[PDB]
């Protein structure tokens, strides 16, 4: 499942 606090930026 998605962690909303994880890196939201491109990579």
């Amino acid at each position, epitope marked *: 499942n*998605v962690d*909303p*606090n*994880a*890196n*939201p*930026n*491109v990579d």
Partner: antibody
Amino acid sequence: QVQLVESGGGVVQPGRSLRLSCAASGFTLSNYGVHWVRQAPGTGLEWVALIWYDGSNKFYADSVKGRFTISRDNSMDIVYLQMNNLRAEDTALYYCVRPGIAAAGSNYYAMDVWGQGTAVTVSS
Amino acid sequence: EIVMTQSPATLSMSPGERATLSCRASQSVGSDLAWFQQKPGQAPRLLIYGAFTRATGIPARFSGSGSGSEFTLTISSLQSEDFAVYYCQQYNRWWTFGQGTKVEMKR
């Protein structure tokens, strides 16, 4: 150097809608997720919403869920906060914010770039 | 939500002194803790992230420490430019802020 630039604030009647926008200067905004953080006159900071770099994941504070909608146009490189059914308690300065830097060994990113803020005044 | 509690509400300081600001979390946030400075009419400015890492451009007299739910911002040899409101923020579980400590001039 690097800045975030917002626009769209103003006086709006209770229950009406208002759309904020955010752009980057000195970097490409679409490389980053984008937050909105608001500050009401005389009080502290309140996180509002977040949109993933590619516009997939969107997240909202409980206080605005179902009323606010976040979106982005990665062609123009602009992030939008669509605010509907506004109330007096949404009166605040709204900051566009970049989560641009992470501590060593972390994949969690702190809010390193803040816009100047656009003022939203909900009033009749 | 995770509640961030700062103390004292106001810290009265003279230039040249050491300021010690406290930030408590209602549960562990690991090291995902940031400190911000804010002056009237201006946006917050990131000082510290990862609990102890100083952001680029910030003078070395600012340092963060702590872990879990207990954090401290130390301003050594305070300068007149440092009178401001300081916020802590956890970014471990959503995003929540303390209510700020005002550092004012003592007299």
